[PDB]
Design a binder for these strands. Structure first.
Ligand SMILES: [K+]
Ligand SMILES: [K+]
Ligand SMILES: [K+]
Ligand SMILES: [K+]
Ligand SMILES: [K+]
Ligand SMILES: [K+]
Ligand SMILES: [K+]
Ligand SMILES: [K+]
Ligand SMILES: [K+]
Ligand SMILES: [K+]
Ligand SMILES: [K+]
Ligand SMILES: [K+]
Ligand SMILES: [K+]
Ligand SMILES: [K+]
Ligand SMILES: [K+]
Ligand SMILES: [K+]
Ligand SMILES: [K+]
Ligand SMILES: [Mg+2]
Ligand SMILES: [Mg+2]
Ligand SMILES: [Mg+2]
Ligand SMILES: [Mg+2]
Ligand SMILES: [Mg+2]
Ligand SMILES: [Mg+2]
Ligand SMILES: [Mg+2]
Ligand SMILES: [Mg+2]
Ligand SMILES: [Mg+2]
Ligand SMILES: [Mg+2]
Ligand SMILES: [Mg+2]
Ligand SMILES: [Mg+2]
Ligand SMILES: [Mg+2]
Ligand SMILES: [Mg+2]
Ligand SMILES: [Mg+2]
Ligand SMILES: [Mg+2]
Ligand SMILES: [Mg+2]
Ligand SMILES: [Mg+2]
Ligand SMILES: [Mg+2]
Ligand SMILES: [Mg+2]
Ligand SMILES: [Mg+2]
Ligand SMILES: [Mg+2]
Ligand SMILES: [Mg+2]
Ligand SMILES: [Mg+2]
Ligand SMILES: [Mg+2]
Ligand SMILES: [Mg+2]
Ligand SMILES: [Mg+2]
Ligand SMILES: [Mg+2]
Ligand SMILES: [Mg+2]
Ligand SMILES: [Mg+2]
Ligand SMILES: [Mg+2]
Ligand SMILES: [Mg+2]
Ligand SMILES: [Mg+2]
Ligand SMILES: [Mg+2]
Ligand SMILES: [Mg+2]
Ligand SMILES: [Mg+2]
Ligand SMILES: [Mg+2]
Ligand SMILES: [Mg+2]
Ligand SMILES: [Mg+2]
Ligand SMILES: [Mg+2]
Ligand SMILES: [Mg+2]
Ligand SMILES: [Mg+2]
Ligand SMILES: [Mg+2]
Ligand SMILES: [Mg+2]
Ligand SMILES: [Mg+2]
Ligand SMILES: [Mg+2]
Ligand SMILES: [Mg+2]
Ligand SMILES: [Mg+2]
Ligand SMILES: [Mg+2]
Ligand SMILES: [Mg+2]
Ligand SMILES: [Mg+2]
Ligand SMILES: [Mg+2]
Ligand SMILES: [Mg+2]
Ligand SMILES: [Mg+2]
Ligand SMILES: [Mg+2]
Ligand SMILES: [Mg+2]
Ligand SMILES: [Mg+2]
Ligand SMILES: [Mg+2]
Ligand SMILES: [Mg+2]
Ligand SMILES: [Mg+2]
Ligand SMILES: [Mg+2]
Ligand SMILES: [Mg+2]
Ligand SMILES: [Mg+2]
Ligand SMILES: [Mg+2]
Ligand SMILES: [Mg+2]
Ligand SMILES: [Mg+2]
Lengths: 159, 238
RNA sequence: UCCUCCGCAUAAGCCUGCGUCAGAUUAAAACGAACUGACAAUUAACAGCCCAAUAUCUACAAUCAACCAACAAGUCAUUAUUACCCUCACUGUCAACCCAACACAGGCAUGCUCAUAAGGAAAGGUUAAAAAAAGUAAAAGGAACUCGGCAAAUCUUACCCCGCCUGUUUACCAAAAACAUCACCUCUAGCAUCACCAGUAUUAGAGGCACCGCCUGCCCAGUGACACAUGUUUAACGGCCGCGGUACCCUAACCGUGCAAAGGUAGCAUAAUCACUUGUUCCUUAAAUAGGGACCUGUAUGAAUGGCUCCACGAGGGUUCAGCUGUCUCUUACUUUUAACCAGUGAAAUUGACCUGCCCGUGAAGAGGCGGGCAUAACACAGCAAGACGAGAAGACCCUAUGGAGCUUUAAUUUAUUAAUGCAAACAGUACCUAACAAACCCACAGGUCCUAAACUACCAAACCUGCAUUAAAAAUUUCGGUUGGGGCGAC
RNA sequence: GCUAAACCUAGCCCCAAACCCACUCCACCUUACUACCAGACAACCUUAGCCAAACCAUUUACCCAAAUAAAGUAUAGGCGAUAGAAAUUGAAACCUGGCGCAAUAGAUAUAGUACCGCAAGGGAAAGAUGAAAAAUUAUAACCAAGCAUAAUAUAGCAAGGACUAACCCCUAUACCUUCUGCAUAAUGAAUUAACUAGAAAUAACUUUGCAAGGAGAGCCAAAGCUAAGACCCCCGAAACCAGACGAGCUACCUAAGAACAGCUAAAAGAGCACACCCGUCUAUGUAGCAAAAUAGUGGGAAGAUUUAUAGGUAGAGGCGACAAACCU
RNA sequence: UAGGGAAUAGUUUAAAAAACAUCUGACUCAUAUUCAGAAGAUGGAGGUUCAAUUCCUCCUUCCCUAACCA
């Protein structure tokens, strides 16, 4: 979103101008996820994927500020979680193939605890934390039965 | 705005349906077409434009009996209630269609051309060249979209390579597949274009609002223009 | 005694807003109270607040609905199976009331009453001047009034212009000849699931003109539009001629010559038509710049931005017969209101200060206020409108401001936007090219040797989207110099 | 002698410091403040313009993360108006204070209430005893305009010179603004009280300090340099742009309603004529009963009629039988 | 009163030419038509230039336009 001078002459009118990228709908295959996705992409995206030698490398290598896509960040978390867990659901009946794929991308592996939070927005992260911390309150009946028993045992020792 | 089209009914019926006027407004509530408003209230009678619609469990050519021919407020041509088997439906009446007549809805194209009776529905391939037709469809099974107005008729000009060339009321030729079904004869109400409105009020009854009083200078668009008939419109894909 | 314009109810609105008691607060006057404090109140049967599912059904108006005849073609209808044992909750209910700053001559839907069974009071008291308002009556005359018969009275004749007609418009200075309109014509469009339209060229939309009747002549050079090979198109924008001579004079059937796309045709004409103009003549009046009929070169009439007739219609504009009348000659009388006086209550514009005369002269050029004269105890009430360049609105006319805004456009600037087209971008593949000839010789043929038998690929992916261009459409932003015996025009 | 006058508090302003943030029960996104039923709509998208350039058309400063300095320098720009860095440099930092207001001030605030507007929105006014009011026959008085006590006596900007004496005599054309020039019959002003309008650099001058140096890093300097003093108003358009709010009036439309006596003709965008709708002509009214009415007289009144209810179209727009109509 | 344009043979046009009219002849019984010949002009005055219808200036005649706002 910007402005231009008509006929590239500053002394002429200043006009609003919007440059839009050329969008293409293409199908991509993920080795780590063993699934095909119909993603709307640009020719730059195709070039970047070629330079990375595949979609999986592109998704794993590209930082968040360069991916500029929530969907891309969700794919990254999916791939990273499978690498962190060494998930057996990838090619369940072909353990050898599953282990070659995971070896190909071993450089990007990270601890599972960290991978679960990759790509999450602050709102999503807050909701995830809230669910982890949401527990029914403990009835005070149980707590008081513990102080009592613990207290009675100490009294017996003094006797 | 909260405009909802009245055209919500999903099941065919011969019961007159309550319809809502637009006033020339679109769904946004702004005037889209000028000169529309008011007029007598009207109910819509659902017209079946697919003359060859066999009953659910039936197939092949079938006949129907004309029960009544009556006025239709929603169109210039008259409409006829026809009954065949256990089904009743509204259709467009032909010039000489009257109660008690029997009409034939066939899909059969034979080596020889049939003797065309007014009001019968046949495939264009089965009709002699020069037959006056009406309620023609562009593609087979699409349903009649052409030559539906009062007194209108087309003529079957040629039949070549499984296709039919017809002349439209505007005189522009129209190529279609020979399996496209048409109705023989002219549409009812041949003297529609001779009617006289007589007074401004009668136009108001028809739902027409007066023209703007703004004077518009005429421009280059105006004045007689003698142009060649447009090239034959073709719906067949080769 | 007199009004009845109403009245009662519902709806909508309003929300305790003339019930009791206690207060002397008050109603544009007044101690009853609509104001204050307290205390009471409207009780559901009227009304509001409703409904198990799925599929399925629903051609045949209304009008006393019967004859009759229609078009603008219409407000009222189910079944099948499954599910279902229960009961009268909740809310509106008052009034002298709402929208109009007000206890406002205004606004305000429906039912019933059709003059009342309901609802109300035009006069605070007096007097009986002017001017003013609303009425009644008027001698003789009867439009002599006046821009005009406005108003009033009576209640009628004929005609003209414009518009066909009913209808529509500047809420608050214009109701019309303006707009619409039946009719006629031009232009665009071959089509479906939100307008157009649940429509399909006897249709739909964009316009012009204005029923009907007789008609609508000539022109496509220019502009526009359309179409492409020239070109087509005026019921598209628009246009539709000179100079000199010839029958005594007017005039020229006629003749010469130039120009143009065509040279205004039919009609009509002193017109609602630049002036000339109160054109000329007949009719109309005692008298007519009015009106009607004609004559008309209108050198600026004129044919769907329509011409010319003609029924019916008009709170349109004009003329007129007869009658009518206080319009007038020329005013008068009476009643009511207002008025004046008494009592109660009690505004507004306005106001430099005023101890606020007349004449002539003077003066920023029209003096109550200056000069020279004259006049002159003080103070109310009622009239009047010559002055206080009277009051009211920082003149709307006019000019000025490097002040605005609306509108138009071949003003400058621009195409971001919309549409079209081109290229790039993106996207699959289908096909790859033939004009000898022996002259001699060979070869059973079929053909060969010599005198060339090379080289050489073409097409090609429709839309959508994005980028860059081009042309349109529809718009945007901004401006519209100065001088000037006011400005403009001319000139500079 | 009345009307009045007088008052010192309520609180408020600017800083500092400190991060900030509520709760009974019940009700509240449907017509909010409404106990209790089948749904599934969902947020982001360059500010513009006034204005300055003495028009205007490119252009015209707007905290963006450290005071100072580098520096108004490099640089940008109808190279005009004006805009304007960085490298580098590098300080201090103890809330409980006031040469701030004191009822026309200070917050609009006693209150976002009353009141105004359909809505968004606009938006006030004012209080005053004393230790005790369980001391109320208390706390004296004197002061604006306006009046009253107490109308007025030839003549005149109202006074001045005077005079034994108010007047009589003589002299004298209010004020401000605006203009060549105003008693002007040119502007403003009833009067009282309160409120209500000159903001700063560049240099220079004056008076101190130190002095070829001055200055509490930067800067200037061929008597300079440092510090100080001292000069630059108020109210007013028609407009322009952005974002909201409006069709309870009115224009047109949508859904479903309602009204239209009698007579003629009996066919009617037909005639006469009520209700009803409109508003031709005249008078009245003109701060009115009324910010468009009243009386009479008129046009229409089965239709392109009139009308109640709910809904729709919104300002670069809507709507329009084009009157540049109408859109509170 | 202000402003623009125009003036060519007797007539009407052209950029010093044509057309007719005029005069001469031939053809005809004669006239016209026709054919062959002939003549004739740059409104006025002043000036530049070797040379001016063709560069300027004033006047006359005529045409067209404007002559307004309260
Ligand atoms: K019909
Ligand atoms: K109320
Ligand atoms: K009123
Ligand atoms: K009228
Ligand atoms: K043309
Ligand atoms: K005449
Ligand atoms: K005459
Ligand atoms: K009329
Ligand atoms: K007077
Ligand atoms: K003068
Ligand atoms: K300006
Ligand atoms: K205040
Ligand atoms: K003044
Ligand atoms: K004067
Ligand atoms: K003066
Ligand atoms: K004045
Ligand atoms: K509405
Ligand atoms: Mg229809
Ligand atoms: Mg029309
Ligand atoms: Mg029109
Ligand atoms: Mg009930
Ligand atoms: Mg009641
Ligand atoms: Mg009304
Ligand atoms: Mg009574
Ligand atoms: Mg009374
Ligand atoms: Mg009275
Ligand atoms: Mg009285
Ligand atoms: Mg008399
Ligand atoms: Mg007279
Ligand atoms: Mg008479
Ligand atoms: Mg007279
Ligand atoms: Mg009259
Ligand atoms: Mg008319
Ligand atoms: Mg008006
Ligand atoms: Mg009106
Ligand atoms: Mg009027
Ligand atoms: Mg008209
Ligand atoms: Mg006609
Ligand atoms: Mg014509
Ligand atoms: Mg002669
Ligand atoms: Mg003629
Ligand atoms: Mg004339
Ligand atoms: Mg007369
Ligand atoms: Mg003309
Ligand atoms: Mg004309
Ligand atoms: Mg025309
Ligand atoms: Mg008629
Ligand atoms: Mg008339
Ligand atoms: Mg009428
Ligand atoms: Mg009086
Ligand atoms: Mg009195
Ligand atoms: Mg004054
Ligand atoms: Mg004088
Ligand atoms: Mg008096
Ligand atoms: Mg005076
Ligand atoms: Mg005056
Ligand atoms: Mg003025
Ligand atoms: Mg401006
Ligand atoms: Mg200029
Ligand atoms: Mg000037
Ligand atoms: Mg002048
Ligand atoms: Mg000029
Ligand atoms: Mg400027
Ligand atoms: Mg300007
Ligand atoms: Mg820095
Ligand atoms: Mg205050
Ligand atoms: Mg005093
Ligand atoms: Mg004196
Ligand atoms: Mg002057
Ligand atoms: Mg003087
Ligand atoms: Mg004065
Ligand atoms: Mg002045
Ligand atoms: Mg200063
Ligand atoms: Mg601007
Ligand atoms: Mg805006
Ligand atoms: Mg409404
Ligand atoms: Mg409707
Ligand atoms: Mg009736
Ligand atoms: Mg009628
Ligand atoms: Mg009538
Ligand atoms: Mg209307
Ligand atoms: Mg107009
Ligand atoms: Mg106008």
């Amino acid at each position: 979103l910007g402005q231009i001078y008509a006929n590239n002459d500053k002394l002429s009118k200043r006009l609003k101008k919007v440059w839009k990228p050329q969008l293409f709908e293409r199908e991509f295959y993920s080795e780590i996820l063993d699934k095909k996705f119909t993603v709307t992409v640009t020719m730059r995206t195709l070039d970047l994927i070629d330079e990375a030698y595949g979609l999986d490398f592109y998704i794993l290598k590209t930082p968040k500020e360069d991916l500029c896509s929530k969907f891309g960040m969700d794919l990254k978390r999916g791939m990273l979680l499978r690498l962190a867990r060494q998930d057996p659901q990838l090619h369940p009946e072909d353990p050898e193939r599953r282990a070659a794929i995971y070896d190909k991308y071993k450089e990007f592996a990270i601890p599972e605890e960290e991978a679960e939070w990759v790509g999450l927005t602050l709102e999503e992260a807050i909701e995830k934390q809230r669910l982890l911390e949401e527990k029914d309150p403990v009835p005070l009946f149980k707590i008081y039965v513990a102080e009592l028993i613990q207290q009675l045992q100490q009294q017996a020792l003094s006797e | 705005a909260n405009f909802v089209s009245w055209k919500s009914r999903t099941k065919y019926t011969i019961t007159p349906v309550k319809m809502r006027k637009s006033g020339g407004r679109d769904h946004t509530g702004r005037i889209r077409v000028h000169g529309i408003g008011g007029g007598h209230k009207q109910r819509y009678r659902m017209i079946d434009f697919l003359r060859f619609r066999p009953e659910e469990t039936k197939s092949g050519p079938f006949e129907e009996k004309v029960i009544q021919v009556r006025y239709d407020p929603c169109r210039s041509a008259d409409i006829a209630l026809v009954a065949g088997g256990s089904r009743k439906r509204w259709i467009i009446a032909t010039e000489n269609m009257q109660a008690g007549d029997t009409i034939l809805n066939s899909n059969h194209i034979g080596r020889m051309a049939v003797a065309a009776r007014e009001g019968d529905a046949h495939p264009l391939g089965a009709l002699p060249v020069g037959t006056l037709i009406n309620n023609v469809e562009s593609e087979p099974g699409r349903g009649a979209q052409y030559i539906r107005a009062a007194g209108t008729c087309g003529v079957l000009l040629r039949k070549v390579n499984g296709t039919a060339i017809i002349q439209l009321p505007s005189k522009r030729q129209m190529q279609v597949l020979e399996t496209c079904v048409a109705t023989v004869g002219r549409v009812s109400n041949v003297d529609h274009n001779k009617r006289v409105i007589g007074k401004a009020g009668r136009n108001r009854w028809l739902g027409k609002r007066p023209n703007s009083g703004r004077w518009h200078r005429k421009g280059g668009w105006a004045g007689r223009k003698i142009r060649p008939l447009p090239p034959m419109k073709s719906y067949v894909k080769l």
